[PDB]
Amino acid sequence: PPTDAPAVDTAEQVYISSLALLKMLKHGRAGVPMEVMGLMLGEFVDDYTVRVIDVFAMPQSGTGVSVEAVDPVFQAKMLDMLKQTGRPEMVVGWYHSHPGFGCWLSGVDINTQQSFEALSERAVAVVVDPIQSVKGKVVIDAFRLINANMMVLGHEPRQTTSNLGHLNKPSIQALIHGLNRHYYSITINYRKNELEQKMLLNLHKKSWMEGLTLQDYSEHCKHNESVVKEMLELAKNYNKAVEEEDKMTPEQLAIKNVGKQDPKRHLEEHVDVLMTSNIVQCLAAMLDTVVFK
Amino acid sequence: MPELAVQKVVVHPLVLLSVVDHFNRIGKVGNQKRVVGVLLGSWQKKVLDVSNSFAVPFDEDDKDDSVWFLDHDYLENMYGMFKKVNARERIVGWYHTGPKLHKNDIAINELMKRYCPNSVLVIIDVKPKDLGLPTEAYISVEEVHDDGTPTSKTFEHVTSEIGAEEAEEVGVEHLLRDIKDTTVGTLSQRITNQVHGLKGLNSKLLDIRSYLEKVATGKLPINHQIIYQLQDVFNLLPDVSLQEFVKAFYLKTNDQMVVVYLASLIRSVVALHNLINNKIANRDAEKKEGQE
Amino acid sequence: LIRNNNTDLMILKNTKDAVRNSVCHTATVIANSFMHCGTTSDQFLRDNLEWLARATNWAKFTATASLG
């Protein structure tokens, strides 16, 4: 070469701002049966990092992911309406849900993204599973198609851009020709602002909650009554368990899972609710005696 | 309202994040400014469940109060844009980024009311500082007064809080694994509620004290109503039935201990039996530690 | 270093043969960058110019630096 040759190598990452993610989850779970889709608005820094700052849905038809209610006039109209708010943003990608199963791209899925590849060259297709994502990590990947033609022509070991890694499996269905023929795995990050963090952190307005109140003292004796009688019932069975365990080997006390009502587990289960209650039950009365003295 | 058609206004976290994102959209040199959006939501009882919101181009003079602009046409376009994406998303009110109320607000409340009666304000903060929730909800009612002054559009406070869905829940969950709050167990959690509660009463009362001190001197014309209510406060304080109350409160405590005693005792016995189990497992592990 | 290279060049031919797939190509062409440090030996490159053509974008940045 007398001049540089085409290049691609890149550890592509997506920042999804704490705002966006919540909208993708919510709106995406709206359509468990018929998955929704949405445009992704934000900026595009250097060339290693997509910055999705915000998203907004698109309408649909009533069968699935049609692109006859993915009107060019919808996204046109909206883009102008968000310029007049104060968002000089452009389309960077398109996300949808594949609820209930693995974060992969289907034939129509692939094909669709191909259109966002002609219209624009920088497109990440981001995937959210509002069902499985529940509680914990939040299953959410990202994918970008890869030129299958160039792969056939000898650039098959030349679709390796320099990404980091962490391995997947259940989507090896279409990821064995996905990761290794049709698309690949981008990696996801977040940006935990301190203002958003001090905002969400709020979940209780207590200046009228506990400590300025306390349950009804006839509602509270009817509670103790019940528990401290259940104590008796469990107690008896507890003696009957302490005679048994002595005369048996731990394999038979191991598989003892018929009527869990007998053992310690329920005297602990109780005492920690009872106590709790009551202690504090306890302090609440005293504290108010001085506070509103 | 007198109507039982409003009471618990419940705002989901993504709204909070949405107004806090809107406050930095405008935020160039147009910051230090009230910014306003419309609240989309659903409701069917004593609730106004807020879910979605989107900024509406809004301007306001910084010394006048009749010079405010709000692109209601923009609303009658977007409102339909979002309806076309989710049915069941009427306009249940509109939010105003604080820090507190402005005389101008009532005016706005009637250019948003041309859509939905019952519209509410939801003052959200752009600065974490309060220890209660950054979400106060007002309604535009009107009343008559014993003094004989003409009817008015005032603003009346209704209780507020934030709720969630499974989606919302999970996103927030995910965003607070840095600031862990789950290491803290039950018992201590509620002691926290009872100290953090005094942290509220303290500053609320403090605010009333600054107000009373404000009219007494450094004059600020008296509003008989405030002082009225402020009398009911000092009649309601628990006092006049002192001796009897004492003799009773002591008794109910006595009970409370009786049951704590029992609790801690059982707890002890059970833990000790646990210890016997350890010792015997240790002897039988010592027979194995020998052998070959 | 030049007068006493005591290392076997038949070990690195098995590692060059086995794995020249994807990033591994870089890895091997840095093994030499340490296996012949200071001994001034570019016989991995003079006699095997096929991997310099196979070299990606940045494997060309770590093949011109293996001579420094």
From Swiss-Prot, chain A:
Widely expressed. Highest levels in heart and skeletal muscle. Keywords: DNA damage, DNA repair, Hydrolase, Metal-binding, Metalloprotease, Phosphoprotein, Protease, Proteasome, Ubl conjugation pathway, Zinc. The keyword Nucleotide-binding does not apply. Zn(2+) binds at residues 96, 98, 109. Residues 14-149 form the MPN domain. The keyword rRNA processing does not apply. GO terms for cellular component: cytosol; cytosolic proteasome complex; extracellular region; ficolin-1-rich granule lumen; nucleoplasm; nucleus; proteasome accessory complex; proteasome complex. One of its GO terms (molecular function) is metallopeptidase activity. The modification Phosphoserine is found at residues 133, 207. It comes from the Eukaryota. This is 26S proteasome non-ATPase regulatory subunit 14.
From Swiss-Prot, chain B:
CDD domains: MPN_RPN7_8. Residues 9-144 form the MPN domain. It comes from the Eukaryota. The modification N6-acetyllysine is found at residues 204, 214. PROSITE patterns: MPN. Does not bind a metal ion. This is 26S proteasome non-ATPase regulatory subunit 7. It comes from Homo sapiens (Human).
Swiss-Prot record, chain C:
It comes from the Eukaryota. Disulfide bonds: none annotated. Component of the 26S proteasome, a multiprotein complex involved in the ATP-dependent degradation of ubiquitinated proteins. This complex plays a key role in the maintenance of protein homeostasis by removing misfolded or damaged proteins, which could impair cellular functions, and by removing proteins whose functions are no longer required. Therefore, the proteasome participates in numerous cellular processes, including cell cycle progression, apoptosis, or DNA damage repair. Component of the 19S proteasome regulatory particle complex. The 26S proteasome consists of a 20S core particle (CP) and two 19S regulatory subunits (RP). The regulatory particle is made of a lid composed of 9 subunits, a base containing 6 ATPases and few additional components including PSMD1. Interacts with ADRM1. Interacts with ZFAND1. Belongs to the proteasome subunit S1 family. This is 26S proteasome non-ATPase regulatory subunit 1. It comes from Homo sapiens.
